Amino acid sequence: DINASRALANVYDLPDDFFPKIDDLVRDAKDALEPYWKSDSIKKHVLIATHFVDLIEDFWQTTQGMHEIAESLRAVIPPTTTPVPPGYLIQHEEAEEIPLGDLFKHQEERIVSFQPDYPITARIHAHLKAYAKINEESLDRARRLLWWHYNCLLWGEAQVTNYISRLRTWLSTPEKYRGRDAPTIEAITRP
Amino acid sequence: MDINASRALANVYDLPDDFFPKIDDLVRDAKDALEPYWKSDSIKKHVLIATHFVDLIEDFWQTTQGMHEIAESLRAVIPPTTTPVPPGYLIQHEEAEEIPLGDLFKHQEERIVSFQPDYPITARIHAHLKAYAKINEESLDRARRLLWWHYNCLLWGEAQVTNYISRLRTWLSTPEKYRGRDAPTIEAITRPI
Amino acid sequence: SSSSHHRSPSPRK
Amino acid sequence: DINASRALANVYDLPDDFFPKIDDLVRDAKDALEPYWKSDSIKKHVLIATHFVDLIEDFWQTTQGMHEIAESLRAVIPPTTTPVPPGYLIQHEEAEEIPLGDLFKHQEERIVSFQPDYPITARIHAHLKAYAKINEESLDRARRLLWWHYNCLLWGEAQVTNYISRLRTWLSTPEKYRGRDAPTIEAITRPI
Amino acid sequence: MDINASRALANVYDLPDDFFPKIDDLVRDAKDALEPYWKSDSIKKHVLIATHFVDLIEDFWQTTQGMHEIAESLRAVIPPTTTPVPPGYLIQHEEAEEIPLGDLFKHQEERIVSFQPDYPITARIHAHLKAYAKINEESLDRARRLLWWHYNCLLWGEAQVTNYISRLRTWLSTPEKYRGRDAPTIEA
Amino acid sequence: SSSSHHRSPSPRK
């Protein structure tokens, strides 16, 4: 639907701070999709949510670990080693262009193409950074889509896409003519 | 073929991992065969499932293989035979759910230190990377299996796919001498008009 | 009398 | 038909030894098509098959002669001249995207970008190898399509499709869940 | 003017080989006009034949012209005056269609050594390439003419294109003074 | 009366 796609894109663009803590998001999603699991239902939102939940719950911890590893490695690489410039590393598009696997060799020939003589301790840092970038992009997209599909399953597509729009508008406008407080789904707060 | 038994068998995970084709041509044929439903904007269950798993693989398999290769290149650098590799102390997929999302490296290095306080930073990195790569590889194997399953189902029906795998397993469990001179397949018929 | 495909796919035995 | 597209892809994906030799293929294709020519029919398979036969009869000889001329120039090339590596040899997709005319100049600038000065003989050798590669790709596609349409004409389309699917599946299995005998042409030979 | 005579005069191969358009423009126009029927997955006679000829044209022509320029370079760096080229001994398509599809090169070598058994390797190569170029060029000219024919037939119609071509020839025959400044067109 | 195409297209004279 056109309004649904509008809300979906506006979600994709959202400021990343209104999305709740991923931990509680996942906990509530896998606590609220349990009944449909027991009932074997196959609704669209149910499928997408119970799949992105598995994806996140499987690949978020390792990505955060990779980031921590890269941050620990930056401290131990020898100093003034001329860090790799941003944009030269393999990104998502050329990555998915590369066939499955055989990407480490491409990153390696790329890092040597910029600096033939580069310590392995920093080649590893660059590789980890470039991998975690892709992982985090995909996982953020998944988090967003999960929040959307889940809140839609809870309240209704045509009741959440009339909140995404109000929020987008109030969020673009400047502060003076937009009241003082943001809009919420009155069904949450109504006595 | 007692339909109940046939259904209770033929669970995808009951496959030796040699039957599935390579990931490359697997995803290739999956895309080339589900593109019609994509362009026609289908909503079918199996289509959705194959699409999700295809995106998952296409996004994360590259990075998992890269992490394996990084573990290798790093083992090529670690102090040789100066650091006994600790098994078991590292956490596999099962204990992952208990750990909150994020702060996994915290627990991992905490255990590594409880094992060897003087553990060199580099071998520490290698252990972390190998553990994470195993965690991802298990789930990617699962996703590959489910993708093959949902794809062959989209093609030939779950009633026929589960009836085929069932026959395949009870064939593999039949001695190579008395199996016969044929293998159970899935018929792909096209009668004329 | 189907298999225990709780979600759309089939889970472990 | 989606099944026809599947069959075309399957044909494009085959071991390249399952097909018969060009000589006998063209022989029996003409021997089975001549009557439709004399009767002035326009069946799709007839059209495609006769056009592909004309193509092959017109270009396979020249392609093979080109290969042999390359192998003969390799006897006069100065020794240990470092034959050009791939990547500096234009392939089919680049040949398709580059304008219809003046392909030799692009190949020349590419080989000189690889090595600034390069002997005329080895230049010729590389040019011929690339051109013959392109022609061979095209003629392989043509041979496959010709066998497909000719056997489709002589034994219907459905049976050929069934056989092709069965055989491609038999080939795409890891030798352990396959059998001990590949599906044989008798399948389409017989009626149904 | 009259239908039977117009139908018996119309034969693409009667054209002067210059009224035809440029190959690249022709191919571009044919591709752009077939794209719709392609996506519709039709089975029309003209569509099939035209797409086949277009594929042939975009794959062979490039290698054909390439071969020509290669032979030209070899002649430029051949023994300049010595080793005069063999006139007419080279085989054309009418003969090449007879030899098996494997060993045209052997028969060409036989012809060359028959004319002269003491002939340099590079001149040998240049001659072989020139002959192959002539063969492929004849075939590609036929292909171009058939492509133009079927393209315009698909666009307008065979009844119209035939009558049109008939008028074109009857205008080429007339003298430049008493003919029209311009040649006719389709849909007149 | 029509020039029946020997092959699918129009051949030479």
Author numbering:
A (entry chain C): 2 to 192
B (entry chain D): 1 to 193
C (entry chain H), F (entry chain E): 250 to 262
D (entry chain B): 2 to 193
E (entry chain A): 1 to 188
From the paper:
Local refinement of the orientations of these particles further improved the overall resolution of the asymmetric unit to a nominal resolution of 3 Å with the extension domains still less well resolved than the rest of the asymmetric unit. The core of the spikes was formed by four helices, with each DHBc monomer contributing an ascending helix (α3; residues 44–78, 35 aa) and a descending helix (α4; residues 120–157, 38 aa). Moreover, DHBc helices α3 and α4 were connected through a 41 aa long extension domain (residues 79–119) whereas in HBc this connection is just a short loop of 3–4 aa. As independently confirmed below, the packing of the extension domain to the flank of the spike was stabilized by a salt bridge between R124 in α4 of the core spike and E109 in αe2 of the extension domain. This density resembled a short peptide and was modelled with the 13 very C-terminal residues 250–262.
Particularly striking is the much larger size (~260 amino acids) of their single capsid or core proteins (CPs) which in mammalian HBVs comprise only ~180 aa. In line with earlier data the major type of DHBc CLP conformed to the clustered-dimer T = 4 architecture known from HBc. Confirming selective aspects of evolutionary conservation between avi- and orthohepadnaviruses, the new data also reveal unique structural modules, including a direct contribution of the very C-terminal residues to the capsid shell and a centrally inserted extension of ~45 aa that behaves like an independent folding entity.
